[PDB]
Amino acid sequence: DAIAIVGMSGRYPGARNVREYWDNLVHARNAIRDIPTSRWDVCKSMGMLDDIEHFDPLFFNIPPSEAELMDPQHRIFLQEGYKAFEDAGYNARTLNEKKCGVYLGIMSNEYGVMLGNSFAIAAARIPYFLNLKGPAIPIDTACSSSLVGTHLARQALINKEIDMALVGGVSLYLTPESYGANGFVPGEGAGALVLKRLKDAEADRDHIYGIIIGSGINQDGKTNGITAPSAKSQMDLERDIYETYGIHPESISYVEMHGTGTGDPIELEALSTVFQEKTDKKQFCAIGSVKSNIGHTSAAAGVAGVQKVLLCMNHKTLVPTLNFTTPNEHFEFEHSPLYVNTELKPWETADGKPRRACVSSFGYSGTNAHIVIEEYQPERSALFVLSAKKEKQLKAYAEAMKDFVTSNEDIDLEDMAYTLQTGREAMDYRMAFLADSREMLIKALDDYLAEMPNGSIFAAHVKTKKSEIKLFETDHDAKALLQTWIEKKRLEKVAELWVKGLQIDWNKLYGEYTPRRISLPAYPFAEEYYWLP
Amino acid sequence: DAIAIVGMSGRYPGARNVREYWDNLVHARNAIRDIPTSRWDVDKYYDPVKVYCKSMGMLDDIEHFDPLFFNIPPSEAELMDPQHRIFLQEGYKAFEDAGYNARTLNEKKCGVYLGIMSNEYGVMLNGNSFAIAAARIPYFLNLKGPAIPIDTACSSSLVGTHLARQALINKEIDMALVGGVSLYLTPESYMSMAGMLSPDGQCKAFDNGANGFVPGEGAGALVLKRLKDAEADRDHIYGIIIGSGINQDGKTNGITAPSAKSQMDLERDIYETYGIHPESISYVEMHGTGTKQGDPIELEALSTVFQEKTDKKQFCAIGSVKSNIGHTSAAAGVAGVQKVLLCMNHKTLVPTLNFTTPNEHFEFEHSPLYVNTELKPWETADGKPRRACVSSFGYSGTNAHIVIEEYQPESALFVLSAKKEKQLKAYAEAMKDFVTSNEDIDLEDMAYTLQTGREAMDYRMAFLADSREMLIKALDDYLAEMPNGSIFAAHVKTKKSEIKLFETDHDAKALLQTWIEKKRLEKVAELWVKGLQIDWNKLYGEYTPRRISLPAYPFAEEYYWLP
């Protein structure tokens, strides 16, 4: 039935993550810049990612020398994909042998040619690293790729062929060669979503961004030139989805258009016509395109749009679409169900109905996709733990957490700790601390970073402390003592032992109030430069 | 109310500055050496039963001075007590540490309170009065606050601190330089033993084997302000003084004996007057001279006063830097205050030395006090600032005790200059070492301090950097004389004609102002080194960086001694 989106990660022009992405959208920021000479010597504009050469190959058990031979599209998605899992609150341990499919939108080979680097391998990186067992399939339907992938993952989950799916897209523009409405400006990006059956997501107590309640794909078929759109195919696609899944156009209040700024009028007419077949209501449905902010992120276009929509729903807020002064002459808005939203405003819904939105993505090869997303409506000291594979990254992790807590005054401290305990892998470099308030939490992380002694803070490298924790691992009364500590109160003791490498049973910390996993900052990868050898 | 310490400079045995001092303390280093023959021949005075001590905490190069810097004729330098000369330098550097310069100090109501207790050089010669020693700095910098030398023996610099504090609180002065300086130049003076000195040559503070002190040399200075002014002026703040007091032993058994009752009264009265609970204090820098009858009296006194107010046991660590550097006499107080501030800044307690077995005449186990011999984190509970005390008692019976509380605060263009090229080179070396040693330095703060917190002198260099590594490389390139297109250097007296255009023309000035306005640094740099006055404030808009502690002027190391 319904598919839950339980994890997301994103890296788009002007946005290193989904929180910056949201902030940029709220403030109507445009990330399009002139192409610098460090890329190539110069349309002279692009929605660019920063530091596309950066990778943490050691994290992924990849030899540094192999990293130079990897398409950065592979490298960046590997990172974003992984972070999507961590966002959902899953780790290497909990993913091991999971029937998780990987569906990766990808549509260019630039690095391989400039020079392992097949589409087939690009999709297979994450399954190989995490020991996943669902199929790994790259999808090249051009700009519809990530949304096509979403559809396929959706169908596999519903048929119970997999129990989880990582869907995503990645697009870089590396060469000069591969490169009011007047055409589009190319964008770069990488995004991933983690999908589950809704019933599983609720039983597993995942945090849920939203649910997919309908999706479809089809073809333009014979058009006037292979890259031209078909009004009829777009209409059929949208109609068939709404009819198959019992979705009334009146229930939809936002559509993230394909909206490349070429094509535009055909898309508008199609969607308008389909809506009007079912309702007389006027100007109820806002339309936008994040391509106005970040450019045309190609294979990653679908996932960029889906993430925008989920963020909108989560904040119950509609954000401006950009570059709109006067309506396209070829379409008449006044008596349409559609209106272009250029305001930052509250996303209003009537009588506690869940917000619904659509995302469209159409490819130059004629393969179309369209999905319908519905807002999800859900029914003392804590022990904070952090770890990373190097001390430098632990420090970066602490900074990321401090920024996050500073930015989010309403964070549930118990949920956050719980996520750090159960929703992250305990790696070799460790710190832990107690806090009973936001202020104490921020102070602790500050103290850690500034190296100001603080009696609530514990840190160790696990390999150094082996002899010191053995006393607890094998003896029966030591375990009983630890269990008494963790069953339950002293937390200081649990903390000291945990940072030294002792495995803790985090479940025992909680009698019949158990907190929930929430979205937190994911691993801060080492930012090492790798390019052509 | 509270007095902020906003600048410091120190020169102690084994330590040319407070950074080396700190390093020595962290590593539990003992700086006491055998007295070399270049000072005097201990064999000509030594008798084991005449001097019975052959050790001293010595300063290096007590003869070095930069008289030209201070507008003093080189020939007058030979006639100056080196105590005067060394304090003149250390005092000046304390101001520079705080980020103040000749320009910003001119006509300031700044008092100068200098601890000093010996006349050896003046006598050797047969200008050098205590009155003149204190007045050197006011004369040089045109300060207008009273200049008073304090001789209460070993309490001198702490007595001075008390007096400066009361003057600031009464608003009689707006700044105070407090300091001490002590040298031991002759066999005769260091000699007086009077039974005071240890035959082993160690201050064994708190130890059952305590048998006298070993003499130490030193010069220190602090810059003090009212806390409210220090915050409004955006000074960097080492710590605050939240209580001080002085009193007398009065009638003792011999004028150099201590009085338990006076020490207790002193400590009690301070705590009561200023509302300070003994439980809040976690370190005390003891007078701790390692004398057999003195040590136990100090311990018992302090212990007793603490115990009047709390049953808590072994919460307060005690130490004495005299275990590291010896008994630096007039400079003892300032040496101790500087130790405590460094501890607070680093949130670290350091070892006190020479402690094997507790003094039999005092039981620690049920005391609020414990001897700290560990290098460890200085822990504080809850939000609370660390608090520490420093005690200094004199042989004449004038005592002092202060309470210090930790202060809890709420590309760049680098410029350097010196009065000679050789010193400019020394300055760059000092900055490079500093940056190398301090991997976490805020580059914007450091530049801002170099711009606004130093006098622009005649020999100049400047450069841009956006990172520590770039900064270090520039200074290396400068020192190695290896071409670097971002390094500029000039002698100002040579370049007058090349600058005049920007000083007299109206649209050249408007261009310069736009350059400083429209953010260009290379241009500002080139002009600055040639002698053009820059308005550094204009470089900063919404965000202004803060002054921080940096290495101070590296004085010329010229030798001057008896004529």
Swiss-Prot record, chain A:
Record localization: Cytoplasm
Domain Ketosynthase family 3 (KS3) residue range list: 1-375
Known role: Involved in some intermediate steps for the synthesis of the antibiotic polyketide bacillaene which is involved in secondary metabolism.
Protein name as annotated: Polyketide synthase PksL
Native source species: Bacillus subtilis (strain 168)
Active site, renumbered: 143 (for beta-ketoacyl synthase 3 activity), 258 (for beta-ketoacyl synthase 3 activity), 296 (for beta-ketoacyl synthase 3 activity)
Shown residues in whole-protein numbering: 2874 to 3462 of 4538
Origin superkingdom: Bacteria
Positions of disulphide bridges: none
Gene that encodes the chain: pksL
